Symmetry: C3
Subunit: 129 residues, 3 copies
């Protein structure tokens, strides 16, 4: 899977790493992938450059808000549900990020849609299952 993080400027890089590690953990556990299936990016924005509201749900948002986009092979509705709780669990406990400050949007693709190196389609050749 590919986790793309959009966050506001303010964190030190150590804070960024903690965030990335916590989220990695939650992903590995929710989706039962190897600990080294780790593909992550971070873009930092100034206050101009993100607007994130709450669709009337009564969160909660501070400048620590983390927006996460996930590109993923298919997963059961159970796995996703698990992922979100595991994710906010880890971010609160390991990073002190309120669960009010975590937004996730997820996009699915297929086995043919990944090549991890060497122009190889590893899900198709069977180098990965």
């Amino acid at each position: 899977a590919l986790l793309k993080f959009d966050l506001f400027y303010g964190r030190t890089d150590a804070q960024i790493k903690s965030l990335l590690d916590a989220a990695h953990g939650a992903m590995v556990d929710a989706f039962g992938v190897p600990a080294n299936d780790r593909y992550q990016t971070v873009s930092q924005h100034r206050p101009g450059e993100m607007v994130l509201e709450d669709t009337g749900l009564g969160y909660g948002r501070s400048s620590a808000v983390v927006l996460l986009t996930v590109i993923s092979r298919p997963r059961s509705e159970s796995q996703k549900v698990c992922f979100y709780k595991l994710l906010t669990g880890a971010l609160e406990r390991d990073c002190g990020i309120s669960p009010d400050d975590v937004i996730v949007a997820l996009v699915e693709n297929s086995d043919a849609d990944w090549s991890f190196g060497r122009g190889r389609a590893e899900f198709l050749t069977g180098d990965l299952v």
Copy 2:
């Protein structure tokens, strides 16, 4: 929905906000979502960092070019058609952006693929419809 904007450096932040507001309006009207279903990001690029041509269609592109990526729950083909015209309508009238300078690519996901806060899947729990 999630609107990700890629644009070239040049705008003041007030110009950025106008753009974001205009596009928000066009989205709310085309898709009939609440005015506070607002999730938006902006990345600014130098001339190196985007190449956007026109597939031989005879637009029109200036450095004001706006590329928009939309992540969305499913929408009818009618709603999308409406969205694009509403979008360029609003950007021309509210921002003075030529409709030649607006590119949109859209990606669909499902109810299970969103969590707006608290590790909750609101479309699944029924906190949102």
Copy 3:
């Protein structure tokens, strides 16, 4: 199609252009699209801001690592397979980028999901095939 590049700071802009051109070539040839169906973005990251491992496959990664996200109308599994080899072929031969340093994730949408200019849905109106 839309090619979004995530790369680490280090390249000159000329190096960036070569990369973008090589990848454009590989895409045009693999997918049989017109040479002017060219839509590309680049984000540069500091060492903090990307973590890209190898899922135990034994690549190979340097700071020249290129992560590519592709948004695309549907393509045959053959076309994609072709694309990845063509892509690493071109990057090694034209840019000197080890095929160990190239990661691709691809996302599909439909004809209704594109508007290249003027709030027009060109695949739907038939301005493009």
